[PDB]
Amino acid sequence: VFHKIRNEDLIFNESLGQGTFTKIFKGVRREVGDYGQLHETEVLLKVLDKAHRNYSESFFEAASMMSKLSHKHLVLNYGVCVCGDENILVQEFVKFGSLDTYLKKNKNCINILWKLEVAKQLAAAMHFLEENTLIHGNVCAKNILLISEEDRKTGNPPFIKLSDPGISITVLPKDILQERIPWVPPECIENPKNLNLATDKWSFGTTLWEICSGGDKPLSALDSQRKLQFYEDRHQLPAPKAAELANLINNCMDYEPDHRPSFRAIIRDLNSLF
């Protein structure tokens, strides 16, 4: 059950973007924190569109299922806004935002060791989810947020967290799922009820391709009909020019779901590139 946050204690500021049927804002939460000290806390606010109240249950279930587990690489959910008739999730504000846009912005200052560390963190999170038999269902670089940049002064790697999947592919319109090829796997285009832990191993491979491609979007040049043809003809993504993770990517994007490797195996591969 979500903690209730008063709207009096939440200020909505700038729009950061949109998700599927949602708008996203930075804001400030006034809260009593540790030792009773009043704090002004940055928050990430996710507002379900008023025209899409039909999806409210899935919208909230997405955050609720992640919030029932605790992990260093999973975004913290703060609760929900007691916000009139609106449907609003309140979550941790991650300083440097989405990995996909960060990759693009800093394609100069990002080398393969940086990409490898982020891939290892993502695999660590998915391993945790796998052990908990918890399906995410929307792993993508947009949904990976950068807490802290590489700090050469201190040697510390970048650190990331994974945000919740949003409204599930099991209820979204077919055309949205097709637009999400190649993150949505072939068997889920066949039938979205095929959502499985193996879904996430496929989507991990797509996200790794995004990590290795400087924030390019795979298959962006293909319209939905052509994206379906990509799966019909059983193609694979092209090797990223930074090709060190090409094999791992194709191994995860296996058209047979049962053959996709465990995240234990995936972490082993990542750690053996050394």
Ligand SMILES: O=c1cc(-c2ccccc2)nc2c(-c3ccccc3)c(C(F)(F)F)[nH]n12
């Ligand atoms: O915490 C944050 C922090 C920021 C953010 C955005 C811009 C600059 C610095 C941080 N940006 C997001 C997003 C986001 C926003 C627009 C499009 C996709 C993602 C998410 C979300 F949870 F929604 F994944 N959290 N987040």
